[PDB]
Structure formats: structure tokens, C-alpha cells
């Protein structure tokens, strides 16, 4: 009686991250998660974790869960911003109202994930990538839930919150018309690794054909190939190596370009107001260009939160693709 779909409310954290709650264990031990479409593993800190970081987080106690199932296989999870190690374990996992015996990593050592960990307010990370991207070859939860016949579509959507405007939602199971407007385009993945797609980029005169776009919820910014970044930054009001770093500019700079991503079936644009972090409290119309330079073997743009904040996105395991639509401003 309600939404046939599973909705998890999302809270924004300083416009750099947003969290969601899920539970682990027969007894429903609560946890704050960072929903990362950039990784494919789920881990929670253990009560056995004795590092400083862990003293402020919520901890999983297997001895309290009847459904706990020991595994003990040692594993080391590494991201771009750090590593965490622990051993595998299996226990009930409750995401929203869908529970399932899932296999996660129990973390006991987070000293290689600082100051990120301690500086952030989450307990663990819930990967949403593909199995080829995970450790121990674990099927994605959203996929599992499908095989276990708890949902009909191996898909989830993101309606990112907007710092100071509204909260967001992760929907597991189906697409809801209330989050977007305008057509809902679908782009195919070029690899069943990350939610990566191919698009043409256009800025000033700058153009990059068949660029690889990775859509990541765990990236506070938009990444761009370095060369692409500086050609872009020529003349525009912006220094190098600030006081709270990177690129800064008067939020009112009329020279700021609008990104253009076009495909065979869609055209998506990101205006300055979407990639500009504010810091006017440091200067009347002062802003933090939210664009990082990053080079991959082949031209790759990481469409992070700045993009997912403007555009509603659907991730489809069944039809291997990422759907994009104009996210509603307030529902
Ligand atoms: C929210 O903040 C950010 C968090 C993360 C940030 O750390 N984000 C990761 C999630 C996260 C969020 C908060 C705290 C910690 C970690 C994650 O989404 C990034 N990511 C996916 C896309 C990426 C991103 C960058 C890459 O370089 C090479 O391959 C990349 C894939 C990975 O870490 C992949 C890990 N990973 C691999 O690398 C890899 C290679 C081969 C097989 C399997 C894997 C695998 O599972 C990243 C940011 O962009 C760079 C942020 O903005 C800035 C930032 C960066 C460092 C410190 C602080 C702030």
C-alpha cells in the first residue's frame, strides 16, 4: 500500500556528499552510507576496528546478530582517496524495506582512509557499480534483489538533494515520473565496469569527440582532461593555488562557458551555475570552479554530482544503460 518501489531519502552534506541509511544484521543495526556508483562493494566498520576513526562511527557487532554467517576471508578495499581492510562476512542487509543475506566487508583498519574518514560523517560505503568492478566478485545488491525476486527491475535512480533547497531520493526498483521532466534519454554503456558512456563535449571552440563519460555519485566535482581544462581556463578570471585551493572566480564572470554533451539521441548541458561552488563570504561574488583536471588512458570526463544535481539519472542493469532526464527543481 504505497509506492511499489523502494525509496531511500538522501541528505546533503555541505554540497560535497550526500548520505543514505541502511541496516546490517538480523537486529537492524543502523548505518550511514555514501552511495557510490563508483565502486562495487559494501563495507561497514566493525566493533573489532580499533583505529581512531572508528571510535566516532557506528559499529557492527556480529555476536548480536543471529543471522550472522562467518566467512573471515581477508580483503583490502581501495579507492582513489584511501584504503580500508577487513575480512568478509555475511549477514542480513536491510536497504529501505528490502532485506537480503548479502556479503560485505567488515572493516577493522581505517588508518589508510584518513583524514577522509574522520573528516567525513559517514560509516561505510555502499557500492553501486558492476560485479567486474567488485572484490570477491560479488553481485550488485540491486541485481541480487532481482534474482531473489524482491524487485522486478534491476535498476535504481538518483534524485540528488540540493544543498539548501531540498533532499533527495535513491529509488530501487523502478522509475518515477515525479523526479524529472522533458524527455528521458537512454545512453548505452561502453563497458560493464563503471556506468560509463560515450559523448561529444563542447565548451568554447573546444571539442572532444567520443569522450568516455563515467557517471559517479561519489565525485563532488566534474573531472576533465587537463589539456581540456586549461585551454578552457585561458583568460577567464581565475588564479592558481588559492588559500583554499584550485580555481576560483567571481561568480559573476560572464566569460564562463557552458558545457555541451551531445549523443545520437540526446543533448545535455551544464551551465556555470551548476559547476560553481560559492565562497562569496570570502569575496563579493567569489566562487570555486568545481572542475578538476584528471587524465585517464583515453579522454575521460567524470560526470559527478554537479551533473547529477541538474539531471535525474537512472541506472539499468537489465538494459545496460544510463538514462538521463531534466531533474525537477522541486518536485
Ligand atoms: C566527494 O569527493 C570526491 C571523492 C572521490 C572519491 O574518492 N570517490 C570514491 C567514493 C568515495 C566517496 C567519499 C569518500 C571516499 C570515497 C569513488 O566514487 C571514486 N572512484 C570511482 C571513479 C573514479 C575516480 C577517479 C579515478 O582515477 C582513476 O580511476 C578512477 C575512477 C574510485 O575510487 C574507484 C576505485 N577503483 C579504482 O580506481 C579501480 C581501478 C581498477 C579496478 C577497480 C577500481 C576501483 O574500484 C573522488 C573525487 O574526484 C577525484 C572527489 O572529489 C574530490 C576529492 C578527491 C580526493 C580527496 C578529497 C576530495
UniProtKB/Swiss-Prot annotation:
It is a single-pass type II membrane protein. One of its GO terms (molecular function) is aspartic-type endopeptidase activity. It is found in: Membrane; Vacuole lumen; Vacuole membrane. The keyword Transmembrane applies. One of its GO terms (cellular component) is cytostome. Not N-glycosylated. Disulfide bonds join 49-54, 251-287. Belongs to the peptidase A1 family. During the asexual blood stage, participates in initial cleavage of native host hemoglobin (Hb) resulting in Hb denaturation. May cleave preferentially denatured hemoglobin that has been cleaved by PMI. Digestion of host Hb is an essential step which provides the parasite with amino acids for protein synthesis, and regulates osmolarity. This is Plasmepsin II. The chain holds residues 123 to 453 of 453 of the full protein.
